Amino acid sequence: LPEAYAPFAPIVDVLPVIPVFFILLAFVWQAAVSFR
């Protein structure tokens, strides 16, 4: 990080794993109706 955005260095390191969770969100959303 170049400048005063430096204290966001924890929440930057969570960002790229977030797009994978949409598949699991779709599976949980279709399990919510018990797959029907």
Partner: protein
């Protein structure tokens, strides 16, 4: 009815195939997907910006997206040195913001917006049989890709320059003055043996 198994005839693991006759929800699916692509392009870029070290060579750090910007030549000098990080930061943050707009549009069409645009919008509506309309949409996509190619041409010809690797004294960013557009040379590469 719409999101049903026994009427649509498709199971839960073939759920996207229930959108074959649903233009608005199909559009929302695509725009949400483009939001995912732009969001990954922002997130991995800012991850590599946060983990980037400038004194160390770029291939020794396991980075893939920052060389794609350094090849265009933002924030680089002669010999392949790295002088700045703020262009990389801008290229991350702009994608990370625009992904929110695309995600909002995708969720709006996929939840509230109308299923069939062919009823109240005779422009955006389309039937899979309508060959003239399919060629229309293909024409719009080709025009957008042509402007996408001319953006790269303008960045090479007028805006700053591109990092050549064949400049003497090490690689260097230079401005292309005479792009060789000989047809007998350029249509050689498409035909040469693989």
């Amino acid at each position: 009815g719409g999101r049903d198994q026994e009427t649509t005839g498709f199971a839960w693991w073939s759920g996207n195939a229930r959108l074959i006759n649903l233009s608005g929800k199909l559009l929302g699916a695509h725009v949400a997907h483009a939001g995912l692509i732009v969001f990954w392009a922002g997130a991995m870029n800012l991850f590599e910006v946060s983990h980037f070290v400038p004194e160390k060579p770029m291939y020794e750090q396991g980075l893939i997206l920052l060389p794609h910007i350094a090849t265009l030549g933002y924030g680089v000098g002669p010999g392949g040195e790295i002088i700045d990080t703020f262009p990389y930061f801008v290229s991350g943050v702009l994608h990370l913001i625009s992904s929110a707009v695309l995600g909002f549009g995708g969720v709006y069409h996929s939840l509230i917006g109308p299923e069939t645009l062919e009823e109240s919008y005779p422009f955006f509506g389309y039937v899979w049989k309508d060959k003239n309309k399919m060629t229309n949409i293909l024409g719009y996509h080709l025009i957008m890709l042509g402007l996408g190619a001319w953006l790269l041409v303008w960045k090479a010809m007028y805006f700053g320059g591109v990092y050549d690797t064949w400049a003497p004294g090490g690689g260097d960013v230079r401005v292309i003055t005479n792009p060789t557009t000989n047809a007998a040379v350029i249509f050689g590469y498409l035909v040469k043996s693989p």
